[PDB]
Symmetry: D2
Subunit: 518 residues, 4 copies
């Protein structure tokens, strides 16, 4: 039948895999968030309308490049396309805006006085790295400028230097005052403004740099929903981002990007400090060996699933769709497995920023996730998530787990949750139900930030507050009931779970109800 329900009845994990049927169609709801980097190929209002229609939940902005005017006009265009669907609130999908910091990046200068010129580094040859600012935009075959000024101090006399996402490889032979005479291990095309990695080195670059201070202030002023904080090495790095944002940026969610060996090693203190994690696989696959990245991924995702906090899988997930209309079989498997592992969000970088087919890659990540959400062995997963803290005195958690148990028993169309801050709907998300969570809120920052969790369909209720509180509760319940009928989540006479509380204000969610859809 549907939803891989025959696979859900399996006694063993191997039999769950064995009963995975390609002729079993999934339900209409897609639970995992899609984050998209917005760049040259997708920043128009026209394209951003079609990204939302294809299934974009979060707009990421990469502050590695671009000025503050470029990002403000992108933010303006996101909101122009988002509020174009706001006239009917039953069909309005909330879209988050995400800032991704530059962080402690080492980067190259301009090849031949150009941004698009390319020299050809052939294998075994010498190359002089320099810090001399005369050679800043005069980068040649023989010379190379970079921006980390303490680079001669922190490298060894047999260190390896990786340029352009790990593709060019170097080895330090002679160490100079401002210079570093290298020898090319893996050659290839060296272009302009490429990221440099030093995987052996204790790089003494700032936690929150000069550019990052300016960028985070801009995030507060433009009213972003989340910060994707680059190169988080410890818990005091997360606290410094929390303190830089301060009072005005207290509701902005900090997502620590684990990009390096020290972030993997000191993960638990980072996770306890952060609001969520990005498994930032690009920089991680250069810093640690590339064969160890899946171990790091499934650790990070699994511990975030255990701790109940958001996790985003990232980098190169549909990489060939920059140039092609359809992905490779690796790329389809990767998106599937990341959703299977328990990533609350999946991300697109160059596919949506500068790709020739950015709408197809959003659609492809929608179609793969929804199939993989049906492919989850919920029987084992819910039984293992229940055993973590199986006694607690908090009354709201008991209602959250009891709702999820109820949703499996009737195989429900939805779990409708009223929430102010997100927290009641966030509690339902942690137990991983099959049913889509419909989070009803009047707080629009709660609506945008609720995309960070698996399961949650946030709905922004634009209705005025009715004079009686009990009638105001039922109005918000009927709103979600209208949403799922409009989206094809459920029809009339289907069963849904409705979560409410006993009084107004946050923290009082104690009422679970099993209602038919009118």
């Amino acid at each position: 039948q549907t939803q891989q329900l025959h696979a859900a009845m399996a006694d063993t994990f191997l039999e769950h895999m064995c009963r995975l049927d390609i002729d079993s169609p999934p339900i209409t709801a897609r639970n995992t968030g899609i984050i998209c980097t917005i760049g040259p190929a997708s920043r128009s209002v026209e394209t951003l309308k079609e990204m939302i229609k294809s299934g974009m939940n979060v707009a990421r902005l990469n502050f590695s490049h671009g000025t503050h005017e470029y990002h403000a006009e992108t933010i303006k265009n996101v909101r122009t396309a988002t509020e174009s669907f706001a006239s009917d609130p039953i069909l309005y999908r909330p879209v988050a805006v995400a800032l991704d910091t530059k962080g402690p990046e080492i980067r190259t200068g301009l090849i031949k006085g150009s941004g698009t010129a390319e020299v050809e580094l052939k294998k075994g040859a010498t190359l002089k790295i320099t810090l001399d600012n005369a050679y800043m935009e005069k980068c040649d075959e023989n010379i190379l400028w970079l921006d980390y000024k303490n680079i001669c101090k922190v490298v060894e006399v047999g260190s390896k230097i990786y340029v352009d996402d790990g593709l060019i490889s170097l080895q330090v032979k002679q160490k100079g005052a401002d210079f570093l005479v290298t020898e090319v291990e893996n050659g290839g095309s060296l272009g302009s403004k490429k990221g440099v990695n030093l995987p052996g080195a204790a790089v003494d670059l700032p936690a929150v740099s000069e550019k990052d201070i300016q960028d985070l202030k801009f995030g507060v002023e433009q009213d972003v929903d989340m910060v994707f904080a680059s190169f988080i090495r410890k818990a005091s790095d997360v606290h410094e981002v929390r303190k830089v944002l301060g009072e005005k940026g207290k509701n902005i969610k900090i997502i620590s990007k684990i990009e390096n060996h020290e972030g993997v090693r000191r993960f638990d203190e980072i996770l306890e400090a952060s609001d969520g994690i990005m498994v930032a696989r690009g920089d991680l696959g250069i810093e640690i060996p590339a064969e160890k990245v899946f171990l790091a991924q499934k650790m990070m995702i699994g511990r975030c699933n255990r701790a109940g906090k958001p996790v985003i899988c990232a980098t190169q997930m549909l990489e060939s769709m920059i140039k092609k209309p359809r992905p490779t079989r690796a790329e389809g498997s990767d998106v599937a497995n990341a959703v299977l592992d328990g990533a609350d969000c999946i991300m697109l970088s160059g596919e949506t920023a500068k790709g020739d087919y950015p709408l197809e890659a959003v659609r492809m990540q929608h179609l793969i996730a929804r199939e993989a959400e049906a492919a989850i062995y919920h029987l084992q997963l819910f039984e293992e998530l229940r055993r973590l803290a199986p006694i607690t005195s908090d009354p709201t958690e008991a209602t959250a787990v009891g709702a999820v148990e109820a949703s499996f028993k009737c195989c429900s169309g939805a779990i409708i949750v009223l929430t102010k801050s997100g927290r009641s709907a966030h509690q339902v998300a942690r137990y991983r139900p099959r049913a889509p969570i419909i989070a009803v809120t009047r707080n629009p920052q709660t609506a945008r930030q609720a995309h960070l969790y698996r399961g949650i369909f946030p709905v922004l209720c634009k209705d005025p507050v009715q004079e009686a509180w009990a009638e105001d509760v039922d109005l918000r319940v009927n709103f979600a009931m209208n949403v799922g009928k409009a989206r094809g989540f459920f029809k009339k006479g289907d069963v849904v779970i409705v979560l409410t509380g006993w009084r107004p204000g946050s923290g009082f969610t104690n009422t679970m109800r099993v209602v038919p859809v009118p």
Copy 2:
């Protein structure tokens, strides 16, 4: 710390056994129903009040003996003693009334014109079994009358005949027209009106006899709660009992006594036709071999736990407490293991009917069961009970299972349920929660019949119906708060699960609420 909660956190059944702790005290709430046979040792109103105080829940009446005049007065005495506590509704316990039928029985006659008198049967001496009615009150060591006139037609030579709870065994040497000549295999003291058993040989007595026809009509007239139907061989035997009760006694719960080889062989059709089972171990120990009774016991209990219908473990549970003030170690192990196996009730026969220590027999069954309930591995048991029917379109089942899950998570004081027919309180009980089920009802039949299920502590609301239904719901909920405070089930500040619905009348249970005790 308490409740065997350290043992409850074990990942394996073996470590659950290993962490069982004599210093870890149970809660005040005892879940298993104690059924008591009332006879001469416990018939007075004065004694019956002390039986209730010791924790009697069901009064069994053996209709093998006694006339309709005698049993009506026994019924009256149970009801006079129960309604003495009705003055204070907080401390009022409902007591059920049960009718155990005679059934197809074979009895001997009187020894030398006397019920009290006895003869000794020597091993290897003869004993002429007769059917001549001049020897009816004239039995001795040579002559034995019995009341089954088709004994010679269904027994061939060499087949065994057991007398007086299988203690005396005889073997047939030759059979006549209206006689049998036996040889005594096992000797002993032969008395009057003792039960005769013929294992292997099929007995052609009816399922419902003409005496059994009149006794069930008496059950309908005297407003009994349940029938313990004796010697049920098949589903048509249950259908015949259901027909005799008719439309007037349609709400009387039939409990089939599985008591012979054919009732074990055709168990599934009997369970389908009945509202419950008694594992009637006494005559089953004679009919099948005595070493095979535990196999039959654990089958029936497990299948009734699977089907959701009640199961009663019976006969000789504290058999030494007829004479002694404290039981043997085997008897204490038997009462523990029955409650551990999943028997909804436990029973006392001659211990409460005829014994010197009936109040101590009720207390000891109350003490052992309450210890056994804490010793249950609820983690495995509930997980396996969830997996029996994990999809159902009935929303009242989803509410019931979600409440049991919520009760495990907060380690709740109780599961308070408003119910009219019993069904919503019954549905909670089938999943086996640790938390006691306080069923609030204005229906007294529902209050008495709820003692059949494990977990249900039924309370009878005596207040008239408040016109505000929201207030009439909350008055009954606060009445159940007042029972558990006074019973020491919980105190002020503890967490309870409250189960109600969205409209009055039966079948509309849908609301689960996690509330603090005021």
Copy 3:
């Protein structure tokens, strides 16, 4: 199907319970050992021959009563009756001899009524020792006033009489009577929850244990064990002369239950001594202590004996009760390596029927074990060692489950390789081949083990001597009905002679 094999295929514990079938007959093999207390009802050679035939494995001697010369003649008659079956070694069953010690005791000094709710002094002064009454009672234990506080409970005469301590002196206590009764002279006293400073062995106990080494007894059932040093004290008494005699600690009280893990790691085995335990702890709590002690011994791989009142009504009656029937079944199902009969076989009117009834109940219960979950939980809980014998043992038990084998043949000298097979609880009977006669007697302590004694000459090649001892076990199991010709069995041997080199697991058809 046979041997509950439909119920063994269940995916859940509940469904295993559901598929238990009374028309599913077991195999001939009965894995659980039967311990029997010998007294006046079962002392003669003709009775003891029929005890062996009905299925007795261990002959228990209660040293609480009877002289040394009485107990020596019991041992003599057991060995007379055992060695009458020696003439065919294929059908020869070895019989263990067990010495159950008296223990340390707290006693009292014409009877008197003790009124419920009254008062009674308990002096330690020997002026008031020779006749006690309703006001004054004497005890022999001098250090009671140290080990008992105010509000402590004191039981007299198997927990019939109960006393609550109201005020404490140096050489006296003054009590309030709770559950009163009739008090006689020289009666047994119990102090619930007290860390009692009595010696591990009494003066009588040192004489009786020394006697056991002289009489060549196989195991010791040491009474009133509270701690590990108490087990080490019994070990010290037996010494080097009786170093191979197995010490089974009887856990009888609150303190032994509390400090169980240190006792178990000191002892060679455990008895759940339920009668004394039922006096000492609340009677409602005895099963909790039963399944704790049985499960932890199953975890550790050491033997555990269920004891006291298991078929109690068979002292006077030819059938047992339904409570008595389920108790013996649930003990075997819990994982008791052995089951005991006390007064049933010592003084009762039906001792041969009771031995047979424990054999019939255990064999049904062994088939009713959920082996699929049980082996899975033992596999998981096993620590990953570097011992070759342990890896071979768990591989053999696994291979017996895969092909549903008729037996596990184990060649052993000490017992230890056959003991390692036993702790993983196979369905298949373990046929332990040995030339050591003490090993054959001590192997009855463990579940699964059917000990066979090879009386054949030692062959020329070591490999052909190994194959003859395998072939002997093939001949036993065919004769006793455990398998037929062409059935599959698991065979454990080693790579060199001497103990601790069992490495080889072979899967062969029976010739």
Copy 4:
């Protein structure tokens, strides 16, 4: 702590995932087979020696292109490079040779706008194709995919001889392009005319396995064995499941075949590309259940055609395939025509070895033992007892003497951690053993000893010599050793727990 052994002790799948450690180094044993497609970037004897050193186990030949004399020389160079390490039989790695068939195919004729209308004709004198029974197999609403699924076409009206169809996807149409039919029951023959002569060539060239293309049903596999014959009876048939019908009728194909290939490139053209992982995990798990070989394939390290490092998706795909339980992992263009062939082989070696340590063995063996049917075979009982024993002592290896492969294949079914060192005198068995996870095959070149017990011990000691020299264990460590009660196949019954000398 090494081999992810802290993660091996976890009581749940979630905690196992939580304890996965980048600082825990694996053992030197790599258990998954690496199948490399040989083409012009990796065809010389010089390069093929370095392919073996990096970690090639099976050389794949795509018979879709290339002549017989080209492929014979390709076969010759594989053996020249393989036998250059044959002087030291302790360090000799056996290398198998695979024949991937072209298969039946629907092509276009000789010499396309979006949303247009073209007509499909079958008159041999507008687009022509060479499958004449196409009108029977497709309906109104069915899809037709031309040129690796680039141009998609939905049929509006179907005639007896013609089809008139609306274009869905755009792009330029050229000559002799391959046509797929999604959902169809295609009556093209199981072996084609060209594939008959390819399969007889493999018997002559002494190949070890056949990767049979486009397998739809059980009778198709039997046609491949009919063509191979008694002269090719020992050559294993691995079915390539390439479409809906192969996925639907999977259980009958697996029964007939010696193995399955998850041929994902052709599958993702045929089925929707989002559903390929479901088909992958179905096919891997059922082959794990049946105990037969499964090969994951197409685009696994695809960017290593051009770049010296893979993508993160490419690294995760190879890891998750080995995690799911694939016996072999394939490289197509990566080794055939790519710029970095040795780097790709190294990367598949490095990823799989980390993934083998990350397998939750505790649940996997518990489940594989639970679903194992109780039969009376001594070999099956010995194998599962050996894997149980190897988990308990944490052994260095499971040494198995095997003639035909079969005893080592039964051990490999139950997925141990420890490398399965298969000792064999049969050279084809040593090559064919690379098809199964765990099996590290070694060819005993020593002559048969007169006393058979000496001949048994010589081969066991040879396995002790390989594992010491390869860094699987050292002297004093504990290993599991499998032997049997007489010579010949089918008699392995004896498990032993031996110290390494």
